[PDB]
Amino acid sequence: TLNGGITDMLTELANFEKNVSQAIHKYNAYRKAASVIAKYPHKIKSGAEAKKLPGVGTKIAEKIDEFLATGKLRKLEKIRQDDTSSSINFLTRVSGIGPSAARKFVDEGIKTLEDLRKNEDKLNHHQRIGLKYFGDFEKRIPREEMLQMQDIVLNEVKKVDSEYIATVCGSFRRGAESSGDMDVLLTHPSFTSESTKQPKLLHQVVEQLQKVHFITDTLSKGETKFMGVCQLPSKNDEKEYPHRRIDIRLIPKDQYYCGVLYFTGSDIFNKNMRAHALEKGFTINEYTIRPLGVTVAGEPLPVDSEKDIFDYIQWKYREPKDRSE
DNA sequence: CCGACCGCGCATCAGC
DNA sequence: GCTGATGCGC
DNA sequence: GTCGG
Ligand SMILES: Nc1nc2c(ncn2[C@H]2C[C@H](O)[C@@H](COP(=O)(O)CP(=O)(O)OP(=O)(O)O)O2)c(=O)[nH]1
Ligand SMILES: [Mg+2]
Ligand SMILES: [Mg+2]
Ligand code: NA
Hints:
Elements: H1 4-19, H2 24-39, H3 47-51, H4 58-70, H5 74-81, H6 83-91, H7 99-107, H8 113-118, H9 125-132, H10 134-137, E1 141-142, H11 143-160, E2 165-168, H12 170-173, E3 178-179, E4 182-187, H13 201-211, E5 215-221, E6 225-230, E7 244-250, H14 256-264, H15 267-279, E8 282-284, E9 289-291, H16 306-312
Parallel strand pairs: 4-7
Antiparallel strand pairs: 1-3, 2-4, 5-6, 6-7, 8-9
Helix pairs in contact: 1-2, 1-4, 6-7, 11-13
Bound molecules: the ligand Nc1nc2c(ncn2[C@H]2C[C@H](O)[C@@H](COP(=O)(O)CP(=O)(O)OP(=O)(O)O)O2)c(=O)[nH]1, magnesium ion (2 copies) and sodium ion.
It binds 3 DNA strands through helix 2, helix 4, helix 7, strand 5 and helix 15.
Pfam family, one: DNA_pol_lambd_f
InterPro entries: DNA-dir_DNA_pol_X, DNA_pol-X_BS, DNA_pol_b-like_N, DNA_pol_B_palm_palm, DNA_pol_lambd_fingers_domain, DNA_pol_lamdba_lyase_dom_sf, DNA_Pol_thumb_sf, DNA_pol_X
GO biological process, one term: in utero embryonic development
């Protein structure tokens, strides 16, 4: 972390803008700047130097000059000292509680973990589970446990139908030594962009995983996306493993490459890549890459590899391990 | 200067 | 109920 | 908050 100090600062500012100011573009501006600085291979010596980077403008440059000269940022010192901002920032740490709900809770006099616990009936289902596992969800997942989890999911999916393919993406596929959660891409020959020849495809998999007590709770669930909680089994006399977040995304089998590009991320990498696509006259989602007409997105382009997608927008291919922005 | 900023699934709500 | 908008999250 | 045109 050559510039850990600066990137932390920008990240703290990003979170402030998202959670407190509810300014989504400032939030992303800060994340963009943090990311570009995080990959810059020199220890930054000044704001002017940082300003040379795409995404770092005049304001951030000044903040970087303040931070290098003093080791802190007055703007942040004050924010940390503001009861309301501190409260809202904390509440948003609960899964299911965002900027709006957080601010609403604070108004109603609900602003601590203790408050939340005694006002459970004021929470929706997602929020209840978020609170339930508040502690566990901030723990990291060692890659070693991710491997065990991978083994379980893949074998259980196989048990439901040998035709399922399950791929663990997210930070895990990018080779991270630890992950915030597990992200599982699912495909089945019966679900393509052309038809759904079989119902309950995602359901049957969730069911099986619940049946074996791997999945423990559900945050949300539709036909193509599951968001919930899972837990590795422990051994006799062993303390239990923390509960873990798990996301499962069912994607049409014929759109696997756009799907896996999406789910592999990182989020900022996708954002940057999609932004570039627009500049090259394409739009990219998790299903397709389409050209943009003189006016509207056109018809989907043939894609037979992740690299094919990079080719269209004229980027040299980047391995998953190099997409951690 | 200033419009535009990546793209979308599920849960909830308002209005009809 | 439906549709569209918003919140929250990937 | 930043930036392309
Ligand atoms: N285009 C796009 N893709 C996204 C976004 N957010 C997530 N993805 C894609 C890319 C992302 O890789 C994948 C999973 O997102 P997470 O599981 O929440 C964060 P991960 O990268 O997995 O790292 P972890 O902190 O869990 O160790 O969804 C977004 O805002 N936009
Ligand atoms: Mg993840
Ligand atoms: Mg995830
Ligand atoms: Na939250």
